[PDB]
Amino acid sequence: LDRADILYNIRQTSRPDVIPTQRDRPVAVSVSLKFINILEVNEITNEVDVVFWQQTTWSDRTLAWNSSHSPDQVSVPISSLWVPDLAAYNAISKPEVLTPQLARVVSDGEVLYMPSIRQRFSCDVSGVDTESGATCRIKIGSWTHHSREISVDPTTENSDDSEYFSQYSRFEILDVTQKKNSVTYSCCPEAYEDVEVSLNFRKKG
Amino acid sequence: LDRADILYNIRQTSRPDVIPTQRDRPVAVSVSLKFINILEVNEITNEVDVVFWQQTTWSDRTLAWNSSHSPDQVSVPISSLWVPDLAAYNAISKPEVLTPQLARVVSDGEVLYMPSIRQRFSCDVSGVDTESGATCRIKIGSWTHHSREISVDPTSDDSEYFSQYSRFEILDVTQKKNSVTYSCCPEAYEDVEVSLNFRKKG
Amino acid sequence: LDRADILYNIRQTSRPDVIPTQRDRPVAVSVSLKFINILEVNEITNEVDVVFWQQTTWSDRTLAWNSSHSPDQVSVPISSLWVPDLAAYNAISKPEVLTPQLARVVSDGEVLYMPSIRQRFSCDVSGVDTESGATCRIKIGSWTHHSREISVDPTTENSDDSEYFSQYSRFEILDVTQKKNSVTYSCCPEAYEDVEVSLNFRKKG
Amino acid sequence: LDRADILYNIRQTSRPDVIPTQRDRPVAVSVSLKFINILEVNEITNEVDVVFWQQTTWSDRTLAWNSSHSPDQVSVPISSLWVPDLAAYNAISKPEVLTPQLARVVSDGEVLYMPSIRQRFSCDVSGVDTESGATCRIKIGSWTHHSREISVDPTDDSEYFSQYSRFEILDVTQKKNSVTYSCCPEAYEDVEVSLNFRKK
Amino acid sequence: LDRADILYNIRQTSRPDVIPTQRDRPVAVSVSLKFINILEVNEITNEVDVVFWQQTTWSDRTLAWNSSHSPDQVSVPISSLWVPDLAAYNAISKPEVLTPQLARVVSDGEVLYMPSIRQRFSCDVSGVDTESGATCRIKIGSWTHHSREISVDPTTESDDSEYFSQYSRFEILDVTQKKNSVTYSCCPEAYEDVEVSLNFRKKG
Amino acid sequence: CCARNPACRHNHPC
């Protein structure tokens, strides 16, 4: 199979509007943020602008193909695939996607989407000039799929929190931590999963 | 029925440009705002910027299916569904939708659409730094449908979703419904008025 | 006929890109501005930001249906209809439509489209802090249709005033007047009809 | 033909992605700026914001219709026509089109497209408060069609300038040129517009 | 063949969503930035705004046609072609494309795309008022195609600031465009890039 | 009607 055939076969059989799941089984989505920059800290109106690469992975076995005498992976535009309806619950601006809206699909059906995103959040920036610094918390989960349809998990996130971070930013990263949350509301018996990412940073000085 | 069949059946039978009325009864729409943040109080030109989840529900029984050995709900993109043409009559900015434009459809034909919205309103912000604070009133109704085609009801006060990191705090949220009949015209016009009482933190 | 049939029949037979002229007679378009707010008066740069409802009506007999045992009106998305190509000749920003893009169509083929619009204008803002105030003139007519294809008229109703205008604006409306014109340019040998709307307003106090 | 048939026939024979060349001659495009306003001068960053109507005409004989009982002209959405890929080579902002994206097609195949455009340029604005004023230079031509494929000619403020601008027009000269860059082996025709203006 | 036929044939054989690899060889993409302006140098936030023409070329032999008694080139809208997914890895703003989204296709299948782009970057601008000036580094490469699928090379000209606005507050001292590869811990493969170094200062 | 409420203005023009 060449790339043309692979893409053709993905278009046949991928339904961008249908979550790729069998009966009650959830689609396991993993998420990791790599921070690139912290851009506009407004000390007066507790708001911050961050740029981050949002590493999102999941499986869709409908997309799989036989990788013998064939490419192991392809780049496919996201409008040809189902993508999880992830949202930053506490964002105060629309995510600006800076990069080409392509995902990598692997022959086993694994999908990797890692857009560079710029987005505004409300965060306490009073301590940004102190040694312990300030913390911006970004809560990401599915907007409409509860835990039996989509689950969301942090990755094992070894690397230098600061590996991708601009050496030219007025700010520096002290720490990045990930907590998982599961929230159940009084209307509805099922839970919504999110990952909360905490960015501890301070002015360089 | 699998999700593919559910969605297929929605595409057959759902007309995004036809109000799903049913025996000339109005479509009963419920609407509630859950406030997430208050972002810029502009003392110079009486304006406020709020973020809120706009919880909107209604029925379209044409969409219903048998939920035995089947999913009880699905997520469907709003471009496949009719959605009520609600507007904030007193908004001064286009509603910025922050979240994926998907609605939940339940097997009985209930539809839930809850976008997170950022939007600007004109409000008196002079007392925001006092103990009683200021009040932003948001008037929501159908832009083109009177009360025999679309009815609107509220479903008060909570801070549950409000950012603890905002400069402001919520004192109170109240929702009243308004229904007016004018002498020209036998139909009633409905809106929901939401009052957001808030102040600068101490 | 139910609403589904009405809409179906509109989709068959409505051509959004074809002006609904009946016998080479112009399409009579009426326009009326209802001012809701005045948002930023820039004293230095003679620029104003206004929110207004642009009530625009016309006839398109292609849309008509028999209203016996049938609804007398429907809401139809504007992408299914021809809409007049009206422009504010003196606007300095794209009209930002705040409201759902639907028009109300009556069984006789009368169409009402009334978007709430936010738009910036260059206008004389000297005097805004005086008792007589300032006047912003907004000139609206068809961008491409001259007077044999589109006519534009004010509505008969300057029987209103400031019931529509926000109690919360820094400004108040003193008066609104509507004049009809037809102007001939050096570019184009025919005349273009416009409505000039004059918004007389001042700072409160 | 009625307007519906005219449009139908345009969709049938018009190729919006194919330049309408006649016998390997370039397509003669005439382009003229009518200035409406000068909005923000920025003395610190040498940048100016202008609004202008971009009066653009050319011929496309594929669009023509020969009548008996027919309109002389129609308004058609620009996605139905080939339009020249004109650009201000030295703009520092995306053109904001303020007006309906319709063009006028005349029965002989003449096309008139005149969008109102707002756009930012770099210009030396230190003299804007002097009597001789400042000059904003706009180079407009095809982005991808060289002089064998598209030619560009002027033909005037034209008294459409807002009385309400902080600025006034001293002079406008619109002259034809050709550029060549190191990027590209061919020459591209442009109109170079000089807008001489000053603060009131 | 006329231009209509050429374009028709391009729509028929071109797959915008398939990288035009010839038997699993990488697609050789050349990239060159021509600087037009430097617009807002923010001494407080170490940020700069640049306008540049992004000269990008590559081959797609599927598009080729017989150029005898036919045009040798055509302008084609980029949505009809495959285009490399180039990105400035270190940009802090979405690229604003100023120009019509058309590329030139030559009869041999070579494609040239040169959008004018405005974009913001983080750069050390502390020396911008000195004689040696400051340096803004832009890293450009494929967002999703590693070195076995896309290779990226500079074209060697710097040799000149030919395109630069006489009216900018800044002047170009030097531009160098050097080839690299990046690896991040995210991704086990190498991504080829051009690193562009813009050495500039505030004018006298 | 003529006046006041958006939807009423739609359904009874003015």
PDB file of C-alpha atoms in Angstrom, chain E residues 122-200:
ATOM      1  CA  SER E 122      10.753  35.646  21.121  1.00  0.00           C
ATOM      2  CA  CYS E 123      14.231  37.155  20.562  1.00  0.00           C
ATOM      3  CA  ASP E 124      16.920  38.757  22.867  1.00  0.00           C
ATOM      4  CA  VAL E 125      16.558  42.445  21.953  1.00  0.00           C
ATOM      5  CA  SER E 126      18.783  43.917  24.686  1.00  0.00           C
ATOM      6  CA  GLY E 127      21.515  44.833  22.165  1.00  0.00           C
ATOM      7  CA  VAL E 128      19.235  46.294  19.480  1.00  0.00           C
ATOM      8  CA  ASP E 129      20.386  49.822  20.353  1.00  0.00           C
ATOM      9  CA  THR E 130      24.092  48.867  20.188  1.00  0.00           C
ATOM     10  CA  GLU E 131      26.453  48.761  17.207  1.00  0.00           C
ATOM     11  CA  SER E 132      26.583  44.918  17.073  1.00  0.00           C
ATOM     12  CA  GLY E 133      22.809  44.862  17.431  1.00  0.00           C
ATOM     13  CA  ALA E 134      20.501  41.986  18.343  1.00  0.00           C
ATOM     14  CA  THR E 135      19.791  38.607  16.691  1.00  0.00           C
ATOM     15  CA  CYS E 136      16.374  37.069  16.108  1.00  0.00           C
ATOM     16  CA  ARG E 137      16.569  33.267  15.427  1.00  0.00           C
ATOM     17  CA  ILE E 138      13.755  31.619  13.483  1.00  0.00           C
ATOM     18  CA  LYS E 139      13.669  27.809  13.250  1.00  0.00           C
ATOM     19  CA  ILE E 140      11.615  26.605  10.269  1.00  0.00           C
ATOM     20  CA  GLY E 141      10.830  22.968   9.439  1.00  0.00           C
ATOM     21  CA  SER E 142       8.056  20.400   8.861  1.00  0.00           C
ATOM     22  CA  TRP E 143       5.667  20.073  11.735  1.00  0.00           C
ATOM     23  CA  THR E 144       4.888  16.356  11.175  1.00  0.00           C
ATOM     24  CA  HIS E 145       7.358  14.926   8.630  1.00  0.00           C
ATOM     25  CA  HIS E 146      10.723  13.745   9.910  1.00  0.00           C
ATOM     26  CA  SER E 147      13.944  13.587   7.855  1.00  0.00           C
ATOM     27  CA  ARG E 148      13.068  10.363   5.858  1.00  0.00           C
ATOM     28  CA  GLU E 149       9.854  12.054   4.594  1.00  0.00           C
ATOM     29  CA  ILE E 150      10.898  15.721   4.246  1.00  0.00           C
ATOM     30  CA  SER E 151      14.347  17.265   4.036  1.00  0.00           C
ATOM     31  CA  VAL E 152      14.796  20.993   4.381  1.00  0.00           C
ATOM     32  CA  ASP E 153      17.638  23.025   2.901  1.00  0.00           C
ATOM     33  CA  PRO E 154      18.503  26.740   2.676  1.00  0.00           C
ATOM     34  CA  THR E 155      19.140  28.126  -0.818  1.00  0.00           C
ATOM     35  CA  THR E 156      22.522  29.861  -0.790  1.00  0.00           C
ATOM     36  CA  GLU E 157      22.244  33.582  -1.813  1.00  0.00           C
ATOM     37  CA  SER E 158      23.364  36.285   3.490  1.00  0.00           C
ATOM     38  CA  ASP E 159      23.818  38.036   0.089  1.00  0.00           C
ATOM     39  CA  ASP E 160      21.706  41.191   0.753  1.00  0.00           C
ATOM     40  CA  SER E 161      18.615  42.851   2.372  1.00  0.00           C
ATOM     41  CA  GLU E 162      17.208  43.541  -1.128  1.00  0.00           C
ATOM     42  CA  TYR E 163      13.529  43.392  -0.012  1.00  0.00           C
ATOM     43  CA  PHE E 164      13.823  45.443   3.197  1.00  0.00           C
ATOM     44  CA  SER E 165      11.714  48.553   3.763  1.00  0.00           C
ATOM     45  CA  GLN E 166      13.713  51.778   3.707  1.00  0.00           C
ATOM     46  CA  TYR E 167      11.076  53.100   6.192  1.00  0.00           C
ATOM     47  CA  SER E 168      11.651  50.627   9.088  1.00  0.00           C
ATOM     48  CA  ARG E 169      13.116  52.012  12.361  1.00  0.00           C
ATOM     49  CA  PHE E 170      15.520  49.026  12.073  1.00  0.00           C
ATOM     50  CA  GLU E 171      18.309  47.992   9.698  1.00  0.00           C
ATOM     51  CA  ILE E 172      19.676  44.570   8.765  1.00  0.00           C
ATOM     52  CA  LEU E 173      23.310  43.939   9.640  1.00  0.00           C
ATOM     53  CA  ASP E 174      23.303  40.310   8.520  1.00  0.00           C
ATOM     54  CA  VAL E 175      21.146  37.277   7.732  1.00  0.00           C
ATOM     55  CA  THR E 176      22.480  33.713   7.883  1.00  0.00           C
ATOM     56  CA  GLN E 177      20.348  30.661   7.056  1.00  0.00           C
ATOM     57  CA  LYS E 178      21.887  27.408   8.281  1.00  0.00           C
ATOM     58  CA  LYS E 179      20.588  23.839   8.196  1.00  0.00           C
ATOM     59  CA  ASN E 180      19.931  21.762  11.289  1.00  0.00           C
ATOM     60  CA  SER E 181      17.970  18.910  12.718  1.00  0.00           C
ATOM     61  CA  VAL E 182      15.995  18.926  15.959  1.00  0.00           C
ATOM     62  CA  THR E 183      15.085  16.055  18.248  1.00  0.00           C
ATOM     63  CA  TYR E 184      12.784  16.671  21.275  1.00  0.00           C
ATOM     64  CA  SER E 185      11.979  13.952  23.880  1.00  0.00           C
ATOM     65  CA  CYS E 186       8.381  13.855  22.481  1.00  0.00           C
ATOM     66  CA  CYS E 187       9.468  12.313  19.191  1.00  0.00           C
ATOM     67  CA  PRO E 188      12.230   9.675  18.563  1.00  0.00           C
ATOM     68  CA  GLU E 189      13.006  10.959  15.005  1.00  0.00           C
ATOM     69  CA  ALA E 190      14.935  13.966  13.657  1.00  0.00           C
ATOM     70  CA  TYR E 191      13.148  16.892  12.002  1.00  0.00           C
ATOM     71  CA  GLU E 192      15.209  18.973   9.574  1.00  0.00           C
ATOM     72  CA  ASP E 193      15.060  22.726   9.853  1.00  0.00           C
ATOM     73  CA  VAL E 194      16.541  25.907   8.613  1.00  0.00           C
ATOM     74  CA  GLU E 195      17.721  28.196  11.399  1.00  0.00           C
ATOM     75  CA  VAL E 196      17.583  31.785  10.234  1.00  0.00           C
ATOM     76  CA  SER E 197      19.527  34.417  12.165  1.00  0.00           C
ATOM     77  CA  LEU E 198      18.464  38.013  11.672  1.00  0.00           C
ATOM     78  CA  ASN E 199      21.051  40.417  13.022  1.00  0.00           C
ATOM     79  CA  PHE E 200      19.560  43.910  13.207  1.00  0.00           C
TER      80      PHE E 200
END
